[PDB]
Amino acid sequence: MRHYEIVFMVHPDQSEQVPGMIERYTAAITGAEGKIHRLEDWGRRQLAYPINKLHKAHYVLMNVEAPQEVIDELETTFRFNDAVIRSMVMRTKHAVTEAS
């Protein structure tokens, strides 16, 4: 129930696969009774540093009322996704119900 704050970064152009992939990642959270403050499409943003050779990602940001019980099964299903550039997590000091 740690009010996690988690970003990840797919390949910039797979815009038809990211919505079927967004259903498929909330899946873990919902299958655990965890609840979602926000789930932001960030978009096709360009990069700070030279990673993955398309010069952009497509990001997501979300805020989850969920337990430690899923954070590795997310760190797993990001790190085994051959098309995911980077991902990170932050926790607590309340949620963020309002967008960026």
Partner: protein, 55 residues
């Protein structure tokens, strides 16, 4: 300043040396000051505060 929304309005508190300014200019209250110190941190690592010119 506890959270992200007002720190997107407060991007003037950044030096031409690209970092978060020493407050002598205006002297902020140590409570109001310490709140912004954590909201800067979370914004720095997500990159909603894009740290300096190139990034």
């Amino acid at each position: 300043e506890i959270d992200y929304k007002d720190i997107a309005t407060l991007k003037n508190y950044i030096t031409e040396s690209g970092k978060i300014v020493p407050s002598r200019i205006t002297g902020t209250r140590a409570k109001y000051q310490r709140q912004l110190a954590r909201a800067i941190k979370r914004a720095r690592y997500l990159s909603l505060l894009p740290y300096t010119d190139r990034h």
